[PDB]
């Protein structure tokens, strides 16, 4: 790897200027580097890791759909053949995007989730293996559409059971991987209702244990439930 | 589209 | 060149999708594939060639201050050291930034100037000559700051002398090179009056013009005439 | 920062 020769701290140093420049492929490689020297990650870079690569994979999920779109409105009936071009730069760019997942998958699966044994590293690696595998499910249209999806499904699942069992429901790590368990049900899987009793569950499970916060804990759960309500809101 | 969250953007 | 095997209006094509999605770097990239076919270009694919490079160099431009501006606040004193890391990856983006414009020039300079012939097309390629020289200068510190600068004023006269002779006082392209050869008087040149008295002046020639456009190029140019009126308000 | 124009953005 190109990082192997920068010290484990000046590539964390580097990832947090690079957020500050708003450089996030380049944060990205910084952060893979820093994994790539296999120590644990603390809750910080863990967080710095998520930011870079959602930042990338965001901006690749948006070309796609402006580009799906295209696409499809060329496939409708009256509209003019212009070519090849417009699928094959949508290719271009879902390669692209689910190179950058299989590149965080890599790193969750070497050695990310092996070596993760509290709950809060636990969640948040399974969180995001649920995440890429769900960005992955967006473009699948093949015969591994399905297991994709399964995929996705299985990592949620695990992370849910465990922040079930070991953490409070205010905790925001827990309520930001029900919300996006929420959004794989109703986008991916087919399951609006399913999406809309988990997000009901979470917000009010989490709403009976606000009493227990400090005023920065509680700022930090109540911003996440509005994310759940805003979704509710959509959903009915 | 739907609202999801990254716990990293969230803390940072 | 990696698209050396595409077709040029496949290029054109995939450069205006890249647009929709946002993706200079690729847009830049279909440009520059365009451009190494040869062929002269038209007003239409200049706007597409100058679209894509300023958004890849801003994008630079607006990291590299973020960087340069940390820098500099850990060299006054009462800063605790922290290593060459801010140093590096302000040379690292700064590097990027140099080659981004050096490639610009380089596509100017083989063969779109000596091919351009017509005012409307000299001139824009001049400007932009000009503009990267400028965004060259911002960067320079060593030996060649005073050549690199040189290098801009002289692209932006070359410019400016054809613009006189063979375009009206309301033409964008005329006005939109009035405006950035002040942005240089002002920031790189350290000629705050020449800069004002530029904008002043195109700002009136322009105004007395008006009256001779259409509504729709009335709007083109008064909407670059404000940008003049902008800066002198900044600036006075 | 002063304000510049690139004249294919403002075409584009
Ligand atoms: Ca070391
Ligand atoms: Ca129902
Ligand atoms: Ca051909
Ligand atoms: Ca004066
Ligand atoms: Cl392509
Ligand atoms: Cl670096
Ligand atoms: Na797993
Ligand atoms: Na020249």
């Given at each position: 790897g190109a990082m192997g020769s920068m010290e484990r701290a000046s590539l964390i140093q580097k990832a947090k200027l690079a957020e500050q420049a708003e450089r996030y492929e380049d944060m990205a490689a910084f952060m893979k580097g820093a994994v790539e020297k296999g120590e644990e990650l603390s809750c910080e870079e863990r967080n710095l890791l998520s930011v870079a690569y959602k930042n990338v994979v965001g901006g690749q999920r948006a070309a796609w759909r402006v580009l799906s779109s295209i696409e499809q409105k060329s496939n409708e009936e009256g509209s003019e053949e212009k070519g090849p071009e417009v699928r094959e730069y949508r290719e271009k760019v879902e390669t692209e995007l689910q190179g950058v997942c299989d590149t965080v998958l890599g790193l969750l699966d070497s050695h990310l989730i092996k070596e993760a044994g509290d709950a809060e590293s636990r969640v948040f690696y399974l969180k995001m293996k649920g995440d890429y595998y769900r960005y992955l499910a967006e473009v699948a249209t093949g015969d591994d559409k399905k297991r994709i999806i399964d995929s996705a499904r299985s990592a949620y699942q695990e992370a849910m059971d465990i922040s079930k069992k070991?953490?409070?429901?205010?905790?925001p790590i827990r309520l930001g991987l029900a919300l996006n368990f929420s959004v794989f049900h109703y986008?991916?899987?087919?399951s609006p209702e399913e999406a809309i009793s988990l997000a009901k569950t979470t917000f009010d499970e989490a709403m009976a244990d606000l009493?227990?916060?400090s005023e920065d804990s509680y700022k930090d759960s109540t911003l996440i439930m509005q994310l759940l309500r805003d979704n509710l809101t959509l959903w009915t | 589209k739907s609202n999801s969250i990254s716990v990293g953007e969230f803390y940072r």
């Open positions: 070991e953490m409070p429901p205010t905790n986008e991916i899987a087919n009493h227990t916060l | -």
